[model samples]
Target: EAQRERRKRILDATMAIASKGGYEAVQMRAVADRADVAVGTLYRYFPSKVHLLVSALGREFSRIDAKTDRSAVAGATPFQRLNFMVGKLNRAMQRNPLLTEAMTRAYVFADASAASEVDQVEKLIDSMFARAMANGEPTEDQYHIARVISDVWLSNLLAWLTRRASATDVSKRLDLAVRLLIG
Candidate 1:
């Protein structure tokens, strides 16, 4: 329990720094200082800055998953629920664009060293989408559809981050993609 608390402190510290100044502000020493742990201790928890940031992103996803209401959109069709879920996620990212950009980059560029961390992030996202779809068991075709939708979602986020698209633009694209694929 003590170790878990320390880990949470480290993650919280990183998140606070990233939220205020984006990814570049998240220096190891700075995080250690903010987390009130030794630099070596922080290293024991996270070997590198990328690992720290990616773990922070995972924490963020866990928070979102906890807060989400799986049955709130129960009245909607599967595709509609998907659109709603995507829109909610996109807007959440937009609320902290800089941090979102950093997390997205970390997630995408994470190499083999960060494979487990990256996989955790991916599974969190996948589970979120699956819950939105509200299907008891995913068929092979459903998996393919989810993959396409995930690609479109990531592309939209990249576009928004690059200034090529607006939040509304992302929403519309997701809506269209869902309609074409599942509607």
Candidate 2:
């Protein structure tokens, strides 16, 4: 538990640095300095900058998992489920704008090991779709369709993070995503 907390402290320190200076400020040494740990300790906790951010991303996922209302839309229709999930995603991004930026950057720069984490994320997305399909509200092709829609969903969210799209624009894009997947 103390080891976990120490790692969390490093992540928190990295986030504080990134929030103030974007992705460029989160050097491992700086994070170590902020966390009051030695550089080797930081390395022991996280081998690389990407490793640290991936761990931070995992922490973010844990936060979302804790806050999510699993039962709120459990029995909803497929379309309703999509809307609910997107709404939750939007709210989560809105709640942590810096995290959205950090996550988008991490997703873009994600290497092989990080890509494995992305695979895990994709599995989570697939499970959600599986649940929706089990309700008999989705087509036979909905699994692949959901994957495409989710990619677009994440891309659109990143676009929003970069100020290339408005919140309304992102919502519209998500609406089109659902329609494209389900229709």
Candidate 3:
């Protein structure tokens, strides 16, 4: 129980720091001070900054998972439902570009040691999207399609973050991709 609270505090402190500035601003020393944990304790919990930030991204996505209601989602067809779900996730990032950059960039760069946490993040996204792809149990094909959609979506997100694509371009491009794939 105590470990849980301490971990939670560390994550929250990471969130606060990342929110104010993108990935570059987060420092272990500041995280320790903000979290009121020993610097040594922080290392014990997360061996590196990428692991810590990626874990924070997981925390954020779980919140997205909890609040999402698929029972009466915004659309009727599978394509419509997926577009709505994608847009919803996109807008969630609209409110905090810095935090998004921090988490998303960290996710893009996670090392081998961070693979488990990185995998957890993708699994959360995969499950949410697969559920959105079907009101009933998703078929094997639906799962495969959903994975591709997520893969493209993630790549587009990275492109947008890197300024290779505009935010409008990201959604418009995804709009076309999902339409083409789902149709």
Candidates' lDDT values, in order? 0.80, 0.71, 0.84
**Model 1 per-residue lDDT at 133:** 79
Ranking by lDDT: 3, 1, 2
True-structure RMSD for candidate 1: 2.1
Model 3, 27-101: lDDT tens per residue? 989898999999999999988889889899888888888988787457888888888888887787778889888
- Highest TM-score among the candidates is held by which one? 3
TM-score of 1: 0.87
| Most lDDT-accurate candidate | 3
lDDT (0-100) at residue 96 of candidate 2?
Answer: 70
User: What is the C-alpha local distance difference test score of candidate 1?
Assistant: 0.80
For residues 1-183, write the lDDT of model 2, one tens digit per residue.
988788878989977876777677778889999998889989976777777776776666556555654465554566777667667777776677666677677777778866656676675665565455445544557677668777887788678767899778877887787766653
TM-score to true structure, per model = 0.87, 0.75, 0.91
- How well does candidate 3 match the true structure in TM-score terms? 0.91
Report the Cα RMSD per candidate: 2.1, 3.5, 1.7
Model 1: ten consecutive residues of lowest lDDT:
134-143
Q: What order do candidates take by TM-score, descending?
A: 3, 1, 2
